[PDB]
Amino acid sequence: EGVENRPFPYLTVDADLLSNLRQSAAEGLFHSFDLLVGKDAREAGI
Amino acid sequence: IQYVRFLETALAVSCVNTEFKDLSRMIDGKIQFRISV
């Protein structure tokens, strides 16, 4: 989709975003999202 | 005439208002969340 998977300085906030998350993304509340399981959960190369 | 501002009212508690003085130039905005589960 329109998701960029380049690495970033991901700023860490303390709000727990993930209240009923995986059911929401499997339902597709978000416009465009990427489920990365396992090996692809790293920072991709530059 | 009632001189009302978007800050003088209470609706701005719902919206963090930041002044971007060139908004006709922005084709598109984007924001990336990364939720680790």
Side-chain angles (χ1 to χ4, degrees), chain A residues 9-29:
Chain A
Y10 277 117
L11 278 79
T12 85
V13 300
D14 206 75
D16 43 352
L17 275 81
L18 64 161
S19 180
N20 192 248
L21 184 72
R22 191 171 54 99
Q23 269 88 9
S24 202
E27 211 62 41
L29 168 64

